[PDB]
Design a protein around this ligand. Structure first.
Ligand code: NA
Ligand code: NA
Lengths: 132, 133
C-alpha cells in the first residue's frame, strides 16, 4: 500500500481532478469530516456523499478558483495522523472579493483509509470576503 | 539536559494562568518568533517575549474575562522538535459581555528545550463575533 503521507499529499498536490479522485478513493465509508464552525460550510458530515453536497460542491459553485495550498505536512508520533499547514485563496462570486486564509487540516487514517478530517481555518478572513 | 518538548509545552497550558505564564516565560527563547492569526484581533508576528506580552498575552488578560486555551490533543511530530496542540478557546469579551468558543491549533517549534516559534490557527470569525456590540 501507498504510505499515508503520500495518500494525503495526493489529495492536494495534483490537479483538481486528480486530487478529487484520490480523496474519494481513500475515504472510509463512515468518514467523519468536520468543517470549522465559523467557516461557511461548518459542521460535521458523515460519508462521501454528505461531504460532496455540503462542502466541495459549494467550494466549486460559490467561489472562483478556490484553492488549498499546503506548506507543511507533519507525521504524528504514535498515531496514524497527518497534519497539514496551508493557505486557502479564492474569490467569492457574489462580492468579487478575493481572500487568503491560513488553515490546518488534521487527517486520521485506519489501515490506509481516511476515517476523520478536521479543518481549522482563519474564518474571519473568509467571512470578510463574503461581506458586500 | 532539557526536559522533553512535550512536557515543556504541556506546562504552558495545564496549570492555572499564573503557572502557565511562568512556565511559558521560562521556556521562550530570546529569539522566539510568535505568529497570531491574521484574522484574530492580535494578528501579527512578534519577535521576543516583550513584544509577545505587549501585543498578545497582556491584551488577552486585559480585554477579556477568563480567556482560556483548553487542549484536547497534544501531538509530537516524529523526528522533529515540533509539538502541535488542538484545542478550544473560551472567554468573555469585556466591552460587550459576550462569550465565545473557538477551535484552535497551535504549532510550536523548539531548539534544545527552548521555544523558537509559535503559530496560531483559530476559528477567528467566532472570536470577532464576540467583539461586536
Ligand atoms: Na505516525
Ligand atoms: Na482577564
Amino acid at each position: 500500500p501507498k504510505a499515508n503521507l503520500e495518500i494525503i499529499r495526493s489529495t492536494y498536490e495534483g490537479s483538481a481532478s486528480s486530487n478529487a479522485k484520490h480523496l474519494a478513493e481513500a475515504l472510509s465509508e463512515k468518514v467523519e469530516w468536520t468543517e470549522a464552525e465559523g467557516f461557511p460550510y461548518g459542521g460535521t458530515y458523515i460519508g462521501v456523499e454528505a461531504i460532496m453536497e455540503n462542502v466541495f460542491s459549494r467550494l466549486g459553485s460559490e467561489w472562483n478558483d478556490y484553492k488549498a495550498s499546503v506548506n507543511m505536512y507533519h507525521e504524528v508520533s504514535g498515531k496514524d495522523v497527518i497534519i497539514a499547514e496551508g493557505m486557502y485563496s479564492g474569490v467569492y462570486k457574489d462580492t468579487g472579493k478575493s481572500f487568503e486564509a491560513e488553515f490546518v487540516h488534521v487527517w486520521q487514517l485506519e489501515n490506509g483509509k481516511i476515517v476523520k478530517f478536521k479543518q481549522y481555518v482563519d474564518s474571519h478572513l473568509v467571512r470578510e470576503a463574503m461581506k458586500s
